Amino acid sequence: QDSLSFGFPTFPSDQKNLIFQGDAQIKNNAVQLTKTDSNGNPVASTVGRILFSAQVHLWEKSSSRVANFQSQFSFSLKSPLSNGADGIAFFIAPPDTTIPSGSGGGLLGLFAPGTAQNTSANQVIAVEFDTFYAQDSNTWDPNYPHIGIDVNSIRSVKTVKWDRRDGQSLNVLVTFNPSTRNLDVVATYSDGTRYEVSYEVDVRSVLPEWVRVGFSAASGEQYQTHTLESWSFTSTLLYTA
Amino acid sequence: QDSLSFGFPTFPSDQKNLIFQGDAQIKNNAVQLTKTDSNGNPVASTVGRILFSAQVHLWEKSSSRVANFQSQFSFSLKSPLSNGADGIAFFIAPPDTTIPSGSGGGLLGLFAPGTAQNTSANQVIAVEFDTFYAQDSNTWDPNYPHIGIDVNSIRSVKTVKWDRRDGQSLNVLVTFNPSTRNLDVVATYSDGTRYEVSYEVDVRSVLPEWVRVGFSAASGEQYQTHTLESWSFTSTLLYTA
Ligand SMILES: OC[C@H]1O[C@H](OC[C@H]2O[C@H](O)[C@@H](O)[C@@H](O[C@H]3O[C@H](CO)[C@@H](O)[C@H](O)[C@@H]3O)[C@@H]2O)[C@@H](O)[C@@H](O)[C@@H]1O
Ligand SMILES: [Ca+2]
Ligand SMILES: [Ca+2]
Ligand SMILES: [Mn+2]
Ligand SMILES: [Mn+2]
C-alpha cells in the first residue's frame, strides 16, 4: 500500500498484529518492554522490543517517491533507583530485524557490541530516550540524560539534553518530511516542558524500501520499567521533487 | 489497533502485505484474481483470493465497541464469451480463512458445496458481483446478473439487478455503520449509472472479534478476468449506545 495508518489508544491484552521480541509483553493495557517481577517492579538484565506486523513502504525506487511519516506515542519510566537505565527507543529497520546478540544495557537492544559504532554495518534509524550515561560503560554518550537521533550507530548524530521524570508520561511526536528530509522530534511533559531535536537524513541511503517500525528498551545493571502507553502511526508515499 | 487504514491506488508487483491464495497474482499493476494465459486471456477452472495481512479488529466484547469501516475499490471484468463467469466478491472472514475444497465456479471461492447454503456452518460476510446465473447450476441465484449481500450463505440475503459491462471499471463503496447496523453498498460506472443496496446486520453475531478482509473470484466452465484495480480500507472501533 502507498499509505498505511494504525492507532493504539491503549494496548489490550488481546493483540494480533504485534511482533513481541525478548521480554516484551502486555500488562494492564500497556506494553512493558522490559521485564518486571510479580509486584510490577523492574528487574535487571532485560531486553524487549515490539514491531507492527505489516511492513511499511518507506520509499519506492521505480516511482522516485519517499514516504512522509508521523509516529505519536507516550511512555513512562518508573524505578526505585534515581539512576534508572537504560532507555527506550522508537526505531525503523529491515523487516527481519531481531534482537542482536549481546545488545543489552546501553545498546538498548538495537546494536551488537562489536559493530555498535560502525555505521556501514548497520541499517537502523532510531530516536532514543537515554537515561544512563556513565562514561565507563556508555563511552559514546554525552554526560547527561538525553534524547538522541541514531543513524546506524549507538553514537547519536544529534542529541538534546533531557530530563528524566519518574512516573510521568512523556508525549512524543516524530515526523519525517521527504521534501526537506528533516526528521523532527518533539517531546513534552503534561506541564508543557518541551524538548526538540532535528536532523536531515536521506532515508533512501540508510534503509531498504520496505521496513518495520517499533520500539526497543533494555536495562543492564541499573533498571527501570519502560512502559509504552499509546502509539499511532501514519505513512504516505509522496513525489519528492 | 483500534484503528487501521491502508490504500492501494494501484498494485505494483512488489507486494509485502498481501496474502495470495489460489491463482491470484499481480500483473500490469493490478491484481488478477483468476488465472490468465500468456496472452492475458481468461481461462476456465480457476479460483483466487487476496487478503490484507494485518488483522482487523471488527468488534471488542470487553468494551462493547463495534467498528465503523469503509472499503472503496474498483474492478473490471473482460471476456470474449457472451456469458462470462463467475464473479468477484469483497469479503470479511476469520483470519485463518482458506479456499474451501470444491469452492470453484458459482461458489466464488467462498463456500464448500456441502454447506454453501447452511448459515450455521459458515462465518463470512461478502458483497458479490455475480455475472453467471444459469438456473440449472446456480439454482440459488435470481435470473439475471446482480449485486448481492451474502451472510453465511451463497444464497444472498438480498440482491439487486446489475448490468455487466465488459472492460469497464466499476467503482464500489461498502460501508458499515455500527450505530444503525447498516451495511451499505453503492456502485457506479463512469457514466454515472448507479446501483445501491443495503442490509441491516449485527456483525457481532456473524464474525469473530478479529478478521481479515480481501477479495475472491472464480471461473468454472465459463470464464472472464476479474481484475482488482484499486482498494482503500479504513476501520475504527466505536462505542455503540
Ligand atoms: O462457470 C459457470 C459454471 O460452470 C460450471 O457449471 C457447468 C455447467 O452447468 C450447467 O450445465 C449449466 O449451468 C452450464 O451453463 C451453460 O448452459 C446453460 C443452460 O444451457 C446456459 O444458461 C449458460 O449460459 C451456459 O451456456 C454450465 O457451464 C460450475 O462450475 C458452476 O458452478 C459455474 O457457475
Ligand atoms: Ca546510554
Ligand atoms: Ca452465480
Ligand atoms: Mn545515548
Ligand atoms: Mn449470486
Spatial CA neighbour of B229 closest among B22, B33, B5: B33
Atom 15 (ligand 1) nearest CA: B134
Interior CA angle at A9 toward A7 and A11, to 5°?
A: 100
Query: Residue B112 carries which side chain, given as an amino acid letter?
Result: A
- Spatial distance between the Cα atoms of B9 and A3, rounded to a whole number of angstroms: 9
Atom 7 (ligand 1) nearest CA: B221
Spatial CA neighbour of A195 closest among A228, A168, A226, A172: A172
The torsion angles phi and psi of A100, rounded to 5 degrees, stand at -65, 145
Contact A2 B17 (CB under 8 A): no
CB contact, 8 Å: B2 with chain A? yes
Q: What is the largest CA-CA distance in chain B?
A: 55
- Spatial distance between the Cα atoms of A230 and A73, rounded to a whole number of angstroms: 5
User: Cell triple for residue B241?
Assistant: 449506545
User: Cell triple for residue B97?
Assistant: 480463512
First to last CA, chain A: 21
Query: Which pairing describes strands A146-151 and A56-57: parallel, antiparallel, or unpaired?
Result: unpaired
State how far the alpha carbon of A9 is from the alpha carbons of B60, B68, B110, B237, in Å: 14, 16, 34, 11
Contacts of A205 (CB under 8 A, 6+ apart): none
- Spatial distance between the Cα atoms of B44 and A1, rounded to a whole number of angstroms: 30
Is the alpha carbon torsion for B146, B169, B99, B150 positive or negative?
Answer: negative
Contact B16 A60 (CB under 8 A): no
CB contact, 8 Å: A28 with chain B? no
**Ligand 1 lined by B220 (C-beta under 6 Å):** yes
How many CA atoms within 13 Å lie on the side-chain side of B176? 27
- Which atom of ligand 1 is nearest to B137's Cα? 13
Contact A16 B210 (CB under 8 A): yes
State how far the alpha carbon of B188 is from the alpha carbons of B74, B166, B174, in Å: 10, 14, 12
- Which atom of ligand 1 is nearest to B132's Cα? 34
CB pairs under 8 A between A and B: 57
Q: Do B56 and B207 form a contact (C-beta atoms < 8 A)?
A: no
Structure letter (DSSP) for residue B80: S
Q: Do B93 and B207 form a contact (C-beta atoms < 8 A)?
A: yes
| Helix, strand or coil, per DSSP, at residue B232 | strand
- Spatial distance between the Cα atoms of B54 and B155, rounded to a whole number of angstroms: 29
Q: Do A53 and A18 form a contact (C-beta atoms < 8 A)?
A: yes
The torsion angles phi and psi of B106, rounded to 5 degrees, stand at -60, -15
Contacts of range A58-62, beta carbons closer than 8 Å, 24 or more positions apart: A58/A92, A58/A203, A58/A207, A58/A208, A58/A209, A58/A210, A58/A211, A58/A235, A59/A203, A59/A204, A59/A207, A59/A209, A59/A237, A60/A209, A60/A237, A60/B12, A61/A209, A62/B12
Query: Which pairing describes strands A65-78 and A59-60: parallel, antiparallel, or unpaired?
Result: antiparallel
Residue A50: other Cβ atoms inside 10 A: 23
Measured in angstroms, the resolution is 1.9
User: Cell triple for residue B132?
Assistant: 453467471
CB contact, 8 Å: B7 with chain A? yes
DSSP string, chain A: --EEEEEESS--S--SSEEEEET-EEETTEEE-S-B-TTS-B-SSEEEEEEESSPEE-EETTTTEEEEEEEEEEEEEE-SSSS---EEEEEEE-TT--PPTT--GGGTTTS-GGGTT-TTS---EEEEEE----TTT-TTS-SS-EEEEEESSSS-SEEEE----TT--EEEEEEEETTTTEEEEEEEETT--EEEEEEE--GGGTS-SEEEEEEEEEESSS--EEEEEEEEEEEEEEE--
Q: How was this structure determined?
A: X-ray
User: Cell triple for residue B174?
Assistant: 461498502
The full 3-state SS of A124-185, as one line of letters, equals CEEEEEECCCCCCCCCCCCCCCEEEEEECCCCCCEEEECCCCCCCCEEEEEEEECCCCEEEE
Contact B17 A55 (CB under 8 A): yes
User: Can you list the positions of beta strands (E) in B33-135?
Assistant: 46-52, 56-57, 59-60, 65-78, 87-93, 125-130
Contacts of B136 (CB under 8 A, 6+ apart): none
Burial of A190 (0-12, 13-18, 19+ CB in 10 A): exposed
- With a CB-CB cutoff of 8 Å, which residues 40-99 of chain A face chain B? 52-55, 57, 60, 62, 95
Distance B133 CA to ligand 2 centre (A): 68
Structure letter (DSSP) for residue B95: T
Q: Do B61 and B211 form a contact (C-beta atoms < 8 A)?
A: no
| Residue tagged 446465473 (cell numbers) | B133
- Spatial distance between the Cα atoms of A185 and A198, rounded to a whole number of angstroms: 6
| Residue tagged 494501484 (cell numbers) | B10
Residue A191: other Cβ atoms inside 10 A: 8
The closest ligand to the CA of B84 turns out to be: 1
Q: Tell me the nearest-neighbour CA distance from A231 into chain B, angstroms.
A: 9
Report cis status (omega within 30 of 0) of the bond before A86: yes
Spatial CA neighbour of A126 closest among A103, A143, A135: A103
- Spatial distance between the Cα atoms of A3 and B78, rounded to a whole number of angstroms: 29
Contacts of A199 (CB under 8 A, 6+ apart): A149, A151, A157, A158, A182, A183
Spatial CA neighbour of A148 closest among A91, A94, A99: A91
Report cis status (omega within 30 of 0) of the bond before B86: yes
DSSP tally for chain B: helices H, then strands E: 0, 17
Contacts of A38 (CB under 8 A, 6+ apart): none
Contact A17 B1 (CB under 8 A): yes
Residues, CB within 5 angstroms of ligand 2 (ion): A 106, 130, 132, 138, 141
Domains of chain A and any CATH numbers: 2-241 (2.60.120.200)
- Spatial distance between the Cα atoms of A129 and A156, rounded to a whole number of angstroms: 11
Query: Residue A147 carries which side chain, given as an amino acid letter?
Result: I
- Spatial distance between the Cα atoms of B7 and A4, rounded to a whole number of angstroms: 7
Spatial CA neighbour of A87 closest among A27, A137, A152: A137
Nearest to A1 among B6, B60, B62 (CB): B6
Q: Do A185 and A158 form a contact (C-beta atoms < 8 A)?
A: no
- Which atom of ligand 1 is nearest to B220's Cα? 1
| Helix, strand or coil, per DSSP, at residue B119 | helix
Q: What is the largest CA-CA distance in chain A?
A: 54
CA B193 to chain centre: 21
